[PDB]
Design a protein around this ligand. Structure first.
Ligand code: HEM
Ligand code: HEM
Ligand SMILES: Cc1cc(N)nc(CCc2cc(N)cc(CCc3cc(C)cc(N)n3)c2)c1
Ligand SMILES: Cc1cc(N)nc(CCc2cc(N)cc(CCc3cc(C)cc(N)n3)c2)c1
Ligand SMILES: [Cl-]
Ligand SMILES: [Cl-]
Ligand SMILES: [Cl-]
Ligand SMILES: [Cl-]
Ligand SMILES: [Zn+2]
Ligand SMILES: [Zn+2]
Ligand SMILES: [Zn+2]
Lengths: 407, 411
């Protein structure tokens, strides 16, 4: 009921009391831990509404006030009548900021209160969606000086009028299977690229083709739109000491913008809610460049470095991995595009977590994701025990729309 | 029930049925996952089912389930429990149990080797002097002049909890740590408390950076006694780097035999509180944890200085660069001196092959991702993208409290 977490580097011990407000399931049981599994009605809605409105009213120091009670009744009334309800703007901004606050897999949550929420609940068409998105992209990008944002489209109704961004991120590179058997571009986006072509996109068939947006308004069939190239800030990748690095032909985009998740606030479901921040360097240099199912360039970089690749024990993979990550950071910094390295991001997070422990009573965190995908042990999060539990408002996974949408 | 795990690199999906045999708890609930928490006398009543469980597994493994030998063994154990409150394992059962506790060790990446464990039965041991002899023998055998062999030594089981055998050392071989008055630490900061006990017990500390600790050994619940391991039995490797000639002048060395001696072995409900076991090192345990943890030798700054990296900002990745160089050094030194060691790529690759084979033949392989993923370069190893299920099978190794915390002193 009071839970202790220890830091094995500093001996510091912290007490979590926030977990007693956990609600959704973890996937784990007393018999089996699923901590490393990536995906482990009117009657239903009012409790969720109440739970949310109670936390909102508590947060502005107005708990049990007539204004609190009157909103509970109003929402109760509207649920009884319409089977759903509408959030006040203040509630929407609170709910969104808190869904980020509660994202146990996010190392960047120190920034959670500074989120810019764009309310797009008046949107009715895919063209309208496209406009809201370009606006979000321009605002978030800010000529390289990135600002966090989320844009919130209309909430689910019957579940057959869903708004969805079919892209998994607003900005991402196409993937194509070649007669050769190999893959050109990003292998992660092969499927989504084919649907784009099936829908009518003229693919440039290159290595770094920014995908078009495929947008679904009001449950209608989704539509293609090209983001104005001038709004997609990209960074060519060079290394501060290896001149040959640039020749590998590498570049990436400055804006990480997740667009396939669902935002849940007070039982209400926001199926299109793209949100963006800025990159931690390892996301591009370790995952995007170096996963075997991604650009997979470790081999080619190690070769240009003339490392000995005869035996794994030379740590050639590791040497190359560092230099690739050095080059990413260097390139973003030289072009004045916001980026954070994993030492700085995790130090910031440990500061955030201690802040949350004193002020909120805990900070749900998923160690498997919070510890960076390289040099884990030499970052201050490795030795930090974490408790992982689900608080609402939250971001949730949802299935890809092509598996569900009826044409 | 069937449980699926996926590999996000290869899309290979595996099905777990072995979790149905799980017992003890994880610490987790449907409301809270404690997957990253490091640590979240038995009655006749609880003992016979534990024994039966174990002997059913044992007789299955040998294709003799339900046999006359099986049933006679259940009955023989049952009555021994009735009349003595405990029972004795056959040697065959002990070997099987120990091998399985390793096979079931969800935090161990080295499990491909589980079936080749040399088991030394020390249940006839009665004194600390006897323990010391058993341990020197274990060390000499396991070390094998640098061609390392896995081994475990098993001392008598717990009886009433007042007569425990305990190795007070957390590992058989480890370096002393000394807190200086100015607040610095000489040698290994992990062993300061234990070093202090040793000294209090009469150990004459050399007070150097790499002093091999004496063994502190408790037999039959008696006060523990000090013994120095013969230096000729302690294999050590001077650490140097294949390209950087100044690396040797850091004065680093490490011991070749990792030998955990503070855990408890549970088999068939019996508790073996002194069961030191050893294998060989994965390079990162020395180069990442032992050398570069801030609470350990903490040499990252010194190495980076000598390399003349840009240390003005974390974003040059100077710490990562030095980390890789130190780990390169450790593996190069070990290989050159022909002392068994495994790099993290080869170890995790072997583990994945082990794990898949365990799914085919056993219906699962419980694994703790937090420990299985190496402490550097996680994502470029094949375990990072591997979903794992963590649950507890017996026989097992368990944590137990440090003995200076519970021991009743006799004087
Ligand atoms: C401001 C800069 C931000 C940074 C540096 C950052 C960092 C990260 C990282 C590194 C991960 C996954 C671990 C990895 O990729 O290695 C992640 C996950 C996540 N973040 Fe952030 N984040 C930022 C902003 C945001 C914002 C603005 C939101 C929402 C408003 C958000 C919500 C999430 C969620 C829901 C996940 C989990 C995604 C999933 O389960 O797939 N983050 N974050
Ligand atoms: C043969 C070579 C072996 C290798 C390379 C190896 C490797 C490792 C590593 C790397 C870890 C923890 C992860 C880390 O420290 O970064 C570990 C943990 C562990 N291994 Fe092994 N292992 C070996 C042999 C053994 C043997 C012989 C046993 C027992 C019979 C054993 C049982 C365990 C246990 C119980 C843990 C968890 C320790 C704890 O919770 O503190 N391993 N192993
Ligand atoms: C808003 C925001 C900003 C920012 N800078 N970064 C993000 C996360 C984006 C992200 C995108 C993808 N495709 C995969 C992962 C990790 C996928 C993963 C992680 C682990 C630990 C294991 C595994 N199998 N997969 C993270 C969001
Ligand atoms: C028999 C054997 C052979 C072999 N090569 N290695 C071992 C494991 C030895 C070991 C010893 C210590 N002191 C700490 C750890 C990990 C400590 C740790 C890991 C993680 C993931 C987090 C954390 N806080 N602490 C492991 C046993
Ligand atoms: Cl990405
Ligand atoms: Cl990934
Ligand atoms: Cl160690
Ligand atoms: Cl550690
Ligand atoms: Zn769990
Ligand atoms: Zn990856
Ligand atoms: Zn450590």
């Amino acid at each position: 009921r009071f839970l202790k977490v220890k830091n094995w580097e500093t001996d510091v011990v912290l007490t979590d009391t926030l977990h007693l407000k956990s609600t959704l399931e973890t996937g784990c049981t007393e018999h089996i831990c699923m901590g490393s599994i990536m995906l482990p009605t009117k009657d239903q809605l009012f409790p969720l509404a109440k739970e949310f409105l109670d936390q909102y009213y508590s947060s502005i120091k107005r708990f049990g006030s007539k204004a609190h009670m009157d909103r509970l009744e109003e929402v109760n009334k509207e649920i009884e009548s319409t089977s759903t309800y509408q959030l006040k703007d203040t509630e929407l901004i609170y709910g969104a900021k808190h869904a980020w606050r509660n994202a146990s897999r996010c190392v960047g949550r120190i920034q959670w209160s500074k989120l810019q929420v764009f309310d797009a609940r008046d949107c009715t068409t895919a063209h309208g969606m496209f406009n809201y998105i370009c606006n979000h992209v321009k605002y978030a990008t800010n000529k390289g000086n990135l600002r966090s944002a989320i844009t919130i489209f209309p909430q689910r109704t019957d579940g057959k009028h869903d708004f969805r961004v079919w892209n998994s991120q607003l900005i991402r590179y196409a993937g194509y299977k070649q007669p050769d058997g190999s893959t050109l571009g990003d292998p992660a986006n092969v499927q989504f690229t084919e649907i784009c072509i099936q829908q009518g996109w003229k693919a440039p068939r290159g290595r770094f083709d920014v995908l078009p947006l495929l947008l679904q308004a009001n449950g209608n069939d989704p539509e293609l739109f090209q983001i104005p190239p001038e709004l997609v800030l990209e960074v060519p990748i060079r290394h501060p000491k290896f001149d040959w690095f640039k020749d590998l032909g590498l570049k990436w985009y400055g804006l990480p913008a997740v667009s396939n998740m669902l935002l849940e606030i007070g039982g209400l479901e926001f199926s299109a809610c793209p949100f963006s921040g800025w990159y931690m360097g390892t996301e591009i240099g370790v995952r995007d460049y170096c996963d075997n199912s991604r650009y997979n360039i470790l081999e080619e970089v190690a070769k240009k470095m003339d490392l000995d690749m005869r035996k794994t024990s030379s740590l050639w993979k590791d040497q190359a991995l560092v230099e690739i990550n050095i080059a990413v950071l260097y390139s973003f910094q030289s072009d004045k595009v916001t980026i954070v390295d994993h030492h700085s991001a995790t130090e910031s997070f440990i500061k955030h977590m201690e802040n949350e422990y004193r002020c909120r009573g805990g900070c749900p965190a998923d160690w498997v994701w919070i510890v960076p995908p390289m040099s884990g042990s030499i970052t201050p999060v490795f030795h930090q025990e974490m408790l992982n539990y689900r608080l609402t408002p939250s971001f949730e996974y949802q299935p890809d729309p092509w598996n569900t949408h009826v044409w």
